[PDB]
Amino acid sequence: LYSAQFDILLGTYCNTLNFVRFLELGLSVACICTKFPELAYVRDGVIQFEVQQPMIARDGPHPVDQPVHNYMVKRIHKRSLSAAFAIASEALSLLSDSSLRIRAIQQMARNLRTVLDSFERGTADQLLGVLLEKAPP
């Protein structure tokens, strides 16, 4: 494009985005997060519940009440997340002049940052989605 005196705005800049963060969300307390890198290779998980029910003696013409327990088992119901990331042949050609390399490392980095942050964010979406579907009125 026709050249000029251009002159960088000499102070005036713009940002691209505003990055979102999980623990900054007030909802982060509703969920106990925990790392578990070997999740993709899991087979089936369960959790145990033992519960003791309180009993208060009642004297009179009623059947004798005896102490009892209860046991509860649950499933490890699991989902997945996916995303996409398209790269042109010219860019990989460039990374396979130096100013173009500088602008490109920049482009690819922008795209990957975006994809990762999306992944995260969407985590809260999935969490909220499950809470609604398990919440009665």
């Binding site: 705005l9 102070g11 800049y13 713009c14």
Partner: protein, 362 residues
Amino acid sequence: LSLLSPINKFQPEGHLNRVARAALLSDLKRRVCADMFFMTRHAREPRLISAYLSDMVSCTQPSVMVSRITHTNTRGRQVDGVLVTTATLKRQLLQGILQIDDTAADVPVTYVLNGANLVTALVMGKAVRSLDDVGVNARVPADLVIVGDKLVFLEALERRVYQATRVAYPLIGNIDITFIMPMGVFQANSMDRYTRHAGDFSTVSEQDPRQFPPQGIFFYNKDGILTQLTLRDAMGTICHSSLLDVEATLVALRQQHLDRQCYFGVYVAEGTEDTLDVQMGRFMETWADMMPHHPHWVNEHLTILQFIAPSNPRLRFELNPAFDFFVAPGDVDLPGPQRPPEAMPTVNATLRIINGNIPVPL
């Protein structure tokens, strides 16, 4: 505002389907019809004004977030916008509606050697007077206010500028309003001709002079004085020659896919030199097979509704209160030979001489 504000609320992301767009359009209908001169009508109740100023300021997103040196509060808070008014708007807003955070602002002053070239080059082109022609922030008082949860300058610049100058001040633009008004209508249904109470508006004569259809309408003028619209006013346009300009209408209507029909109502024959006994009898058996379908001009028992329903074809042939349109043989002089000749069926019109020539649905 009246359009933009609901947009950011009811539009989730864009590309809303037909039904969502229709619902949104209706919502904007209602929103504009209600809240368009909203301050003047709702001036007595202060809270809502603040309520929706908070909406408008936090309803327009930001722009690019450049800031290296910029206007700011004495406390140091970064100012972010400006709201312009007039003197009256200034006074009523600052009376008790809003609250002031600060009475003056910190302002950038830089952004003058080059401007002096104008004075030195001024007399240079005229005379020898060139040698004689020339021979960080600041605290400035300004109005700052907090609306909703945000800061804004609020100014009514009318004394500093635009005062005692031939140029008029903007923001006092004009608004067009299209008033629609029924004038000589009548409710057909006697079921709708009900009285709210028996003795509402009665007279001393035996017959009520209110059963009669209205002949005019009344309404308030600029200063609210009752005024008159009557049919005599309509005479200035409805009596013109333009009512009889159906020529181009016939031109246009002749170019559509037209199907054949019985000619019992358009064909005119001549006397066959007889005693009318043989004539009508022969016409009688002729009329036995002359009817290939239901004639169009038989269902006058229909009421307004199904009549104006799109199913009735007759509507596309109802065009002018002064005429009727119909299908007739082409290339035939009237009166014509009694045997109806084969012809390409065209469209013709007849005069509604009597007002009663209008079909009874109307």
